Design a protein around this ligand. Structure first.
Ligand code: ACO
Ligand code: ACO
Ligand code: ACO
Lengths: 449, 449, 449
């Protein structure tokens, strides 16, 4: 009973880009995805996105979450909305029309837009907003009942109408049946040759139908990004929105102007975020965490009490009270247990570090399992790749792998094992063993007399 | 003759925190510590801090620098001040009352507050300030002599009094004897059931005693932090204060909005601080230093001419013209001499690097002494930990430790020694020696024909 | 036919510096260099810079691009300009006078200044600007023809003249012959004992010569840096100028307030610059590049499609679709081909990595050539320095150098070679070979029973 049409065919010429406008990112995700999530979060079931030539990247990114309709020619917004008729023309209920270049639109406003429309039994409802400098925008003229009288564009406005501060956002809610009926009645008798969607509204008005106006108190949210300066203004607007939310929810953010937290991040209370931190994707941070300065964390889970210092973390999990960094990298599939230590200049990839394990410096752990409380010395490497395949390394619990050791996978090191520093280990090592593979020392005294 | 009562029992509910409000940090230290230092710096000898249930962390952090008095119930500010009677009731002289959630309060203003109070022989003095939007604050009504007539709260203020821009800061100076006398005379005949400290002032007034008003020209400094948004505003205020001080003192700060220098840092002239740098604790930086972008330095000494590039430095000392980084870590007890080089991906901990020593890449030096002009090759490690104890490594002067060498401590390498690349060294090496511990090379030509 | 005199002898006492004022940097280069480039970019052929005692650093930095004249005493701006008479007194054409402490001056404004001067056949032209708060600056009084009547300093101005918003910038264009003629006629009959350059203008006026006024619409550009707070304001002004330019030219800048791009950097469209990035010197970045957060890039070339993540890059070249970082360092002379990978904690110096080569972690490559598609294992080192000289390493194509290998230069590894992990390689290795230099493994089962 609720549908949505997202306009994504814009060339965005001022972007000076080879990519479609709505694919440029804010807070780590394309603008069209922000709109999609606000639309879906508002209660819309079916979504159609209008695309242009060479829109594989748009369809590729949005995937199955949207239907698609192709606009071969740019003949205006009314024309673009009509291309969705294949999917929606015979549907009943509410349909909202939004542009994919308005990434700050909130689901709250779309919800209320739809509720206002439905509770009024309107044929169409305009999302409006009040701005300080209205120059250039279509002005809402209200009738005596508070409903829409007309949208006066500035090019055809008397001096009185020009003083109106309430403007059209270009976001509308329609009776779906009416919308597609009136779309066939729009003409392009103008200098651009285009079919303009607001014309539908005048058509409903000249038919005695109800056209409502709903005004949002947040004019920032209807921002339309047309160039990369505006793109950066959208980032700053989203930054302030999100950071204010987290601070009032119990997260300390030392410098919110320099801290970048995407919209799908959840952060528990009493957590401290230091300056420059960048947290994006679907990330969950527990209570009492410290994320240290200039870290980057994407699509990860960080449990309570953990400390991440100037590190890079992607698609990883970090258990309770675990310490990572400074200058460490957790790559996809890194899984650290509780009370683990991953020190400076350590890289972890597709590896499971059990509780209490310590990898304190200058090591690489890949395709590997490190048992509880095991110590991995400085300079040690899981040698996992042979130029053809990747092979697994297993280290048991309470073991001590010395410094500058190479574990040549596939290989298994038992529990309570000591591997001497400097050893290249090719053979499995049983529990409670000493393993050594290095030359003994020759000292040539006075060789340099 | 001068005492202070610091109110620290606030729950700070809007903080959404499990910790006491005054323990949250600005510029690297709890707000209550900022207040303590301003109080002590103003000439106050004895300090009492009022605490609540479970205040071990407050007492633990402030230690012996303060006495403590327990407030079992939250019955208002007058009640909280009274809990200090155990320590102060029979004392003579001036007593100032400040809240632990006002971290920007300066010692200069507290000094002048006390001097104004004493030079007037007042029984009490109110710190006031002038604000643009006075809504909500108690208004200072002055009498014909310029002294205090009454503090009108907004809830009980006529339309005239509401236009007053001068407000009460809630910071007072008292004759100590009078204060504790009048505290027993305060009632809680109000809707909150609380004993309010400003009531003491009206009591002195109705007794013919002198009540002065001292106005600070800096209304920022009386800021009371009640949530984490305000906490971030306090950080930005302290940032601007400190950075302006250093720039006018001869320090170049490339981007002061992104540079974080705590209040106990001293920086010599002609030093350059690059963007993102974070410097905290008791740190001393000499003249002609460059601190490069996104470094973190805490509780350290950096001598003249040194260069620190994107590195992490804690509890360390760096001698003149020494170069550190990019991406190096100096851990507690790292001591670098003059003209030393510590290169990328090097970690130094509890180690003494004498003048001219070079550790240029991918090395770990712990619990060790490196002599003058000695070169430590890439990938080399002091193997200091055996899973039970830590052991020391000594390297002499003018020595050359090759790449990927493991020094298995305890071990001593003499002067003018060469250790061949790839050696695990277990035995002491005398002066002017060659030491080698590695396999010779086998070449299997056409093995991969 | 066009000359320039740059005043660089200022002590800049408020700088609290041991260095000359105009040598302090904005956007990675001394203020006097910014002025020089604007001057040269305006069509000026001959440049004279006026210097003081101990100006070796000024001459050293600006080199042969400028002539030099020495000002022994600070007797005013007219005196300073006169010291250029040795080089210019007998020249014909236009001469502009600018200060070396005005780093935001644009070549566009200097061009138009010169064109206005020449097209008017003026004897002198004043660069003016309109400011909101004119207090303190000399005011332009225009005559009935629009030409200059007089510059009224505030100390000698009637209440009317004080309301003028148009002020003198202190930047002038002169008929070169007139300028040096009138310089001998300036007196120092004032409280400072100084010869003031604007006096030349009154001399031309009292002779019936034409004195024009050209007003720039950008009052920011005439900013004179007198202390380090103002120095930081110049950095922010240049930051906003440059970042706006790149955004409107098709570069996405995620946080332009925290992104620092020098004026000699060129960046191709569809490139993304993440927060904290610092790019300086003569750097060329191609299209479709990602520069990741908190990177530093100086004097380098980055080709299309490359990705640089939190890394330090100096005097290096990076080929198309090559990936660098996080936490890597490219040092002078690093040359990476196309589709190369340089992973975390890798250092490259004076080394050529051919197309497809991979150095993925914890390695050092110096003075070396790495052939196409060759894989350098983790922990591997080109051992290039012997404490006396540096020696070269050659690795062929399609080779596999195992982990923790030391290549002791000079040494040559052939094509399709495998070097076993843990090997110290001292001898050349022919094509299609296996090379190994490590101890075999001893396993002492139950040694730790
Ligand atoms: C910075 C950090 O990360 S610190 C954390 C990392 N910690 C480490 O790397 C510690 C590593 N320590 C070592 O490698 C030490 O040299 C140790 C533990 C092997 C010393 O062994 P110790 O027991 O002290 O000495 P010892 O010489 O008796 O060695 C024990 C056995 O190994 C044998 N052995 C010693 N060296 C060798 C060798 N090169 N080849 C073969 N066997 C050897 C001894 O002969 C003895 O065997 P046996 O009892 O059958 O005769
Ligand atoms: C990237 C950076 O950090 S660069 C800075 C680090 N620099 C280094 O690591 C440089 C290290 N260099 C090396 O290890 C070299 O291989 C060197 C210095 C040992 C070369 O030694 P050279 O003198 O050139 O050669 P040579 O083979 O003659 O070695 C000298 C002695 O060592 C002996 N020797 C050589 N290899 C071995 C070995 N594996 N085991 C035992 N003895 C050996 C030789 O037999 C000779 O002894 P002798 O005179 O009694 O016969
Ligand atoms: C994390 C990363 O960066 S992963 C990417 C890096 N990858 C690597 O480092 C992989 C390195 N792999 C290795 O070093 C392995 O141990 C390999 C490739 C040498 C294994 O060799 P394999 O062919 O599997 O085994 P094998 O034991 O048969 O060795 C082949 C030959 O070397 C010989 N050999 C093995 N070890 C030694 C040794 N220590 N000394 C001398 N010769 C040796 C064997 O005797 C055999 O020779 P032969 O045919 O004449 O008898």
């Amino acid at each position: 009973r609720r549908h949505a049409i997202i306009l994504a065919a814009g060339k965005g010429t001022r972007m000076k880009s080879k990519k479609y406008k709505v694919l440029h990112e804010v807070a780590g995700k394309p603008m069209v995805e922000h709109v999609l999530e606000s639309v879906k979060g508002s209660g819309v079931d079916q979504v159609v996105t209008i695309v242009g030539h060479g829109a594989e990247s748009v369809k590729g990114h949005l995937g199955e979450r949207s239907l698609y309709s192709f606009q071969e020619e740019q003949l205006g917004t009314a024309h673009a909305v009509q291309m969705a008729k294949s999917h929606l023309e015979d549907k009943e209920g509410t349909t909202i029309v939004v542009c994919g270049d308005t990434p700050l639109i909130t689901k709250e406003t779309l919800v209320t837009l739809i509720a206002h429309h439905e509770d009024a039994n309107a044929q169409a409802t305009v999302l409006s907003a009040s701005i300080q400098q209205p120059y250039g925008y279509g002005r809402i003229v209200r009738n005596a009942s508070g409903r829409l009288e007309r949208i006066v564009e500035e090019k055809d406005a008397t001096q009185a109408e020009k003083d109106i501060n309430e403007i059209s956002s270009g976001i509308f809610a329609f009776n779906n049946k009416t919308l597609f009926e009136k779309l066939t009645q729009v003409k392009n008798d103008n200098a651009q040759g285009e079919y303009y969607l607001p014309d539908v509204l005048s058509l409903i008005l000249n038919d005695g139908g109800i056209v409502e106006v709903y005004r949002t108190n947040d004019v920032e949210e209807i921002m339309g990004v047309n160039d990369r300066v505006m793109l950066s203004q959208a980032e700053k607007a989203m930054q302030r929105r999100t950071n204010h939310y987290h601070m009032l929810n119990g997260v300390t953010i030392i410098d919110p102007d320099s801290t970048y937290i995407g919209p799908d991040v959840t952060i528990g209370s009493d957590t401290v975020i230091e300056p420059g931190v960048r947290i994006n994707g679907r990330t969950e941070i527990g209570e009492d965490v410290v994320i240290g300065q200039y870290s980057e964390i994407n699509n990860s889970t960080i449990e309570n009490g953990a400390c991440i210092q100037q590190s890079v973390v992607n698609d990883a999990s970090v258990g309770a009270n675990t310490k990572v960094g400074p200058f460490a990298q957790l790559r996809p599939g890194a899984q650290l247990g509780a009370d683990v230590k991953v020190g400076n200049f350590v890289e972890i990839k597709k590896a499971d570090l059990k509780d209490g394990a310590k990898v304190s410096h200058l090591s690489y752990i890949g395709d590997a399992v490190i048992g509880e409380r095991t110590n991995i010395g400085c300079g040690t490497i899981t040698v996992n790749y042979d130029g053809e395949n990747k092979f697994k390394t297993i280290v048991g619990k309470d073991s001590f792998v010395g410094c500058n050791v190479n574990l040549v996978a596939p290989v298994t090191i038992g529990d309570d094992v000591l591997v001497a520093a400097g050893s290249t280990i090719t053979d499995d090592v049983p529990n409670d063993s000493l393993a050594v593979a290095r030359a003994r020392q020759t000292t040539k005294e006075g060789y340099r007399k």
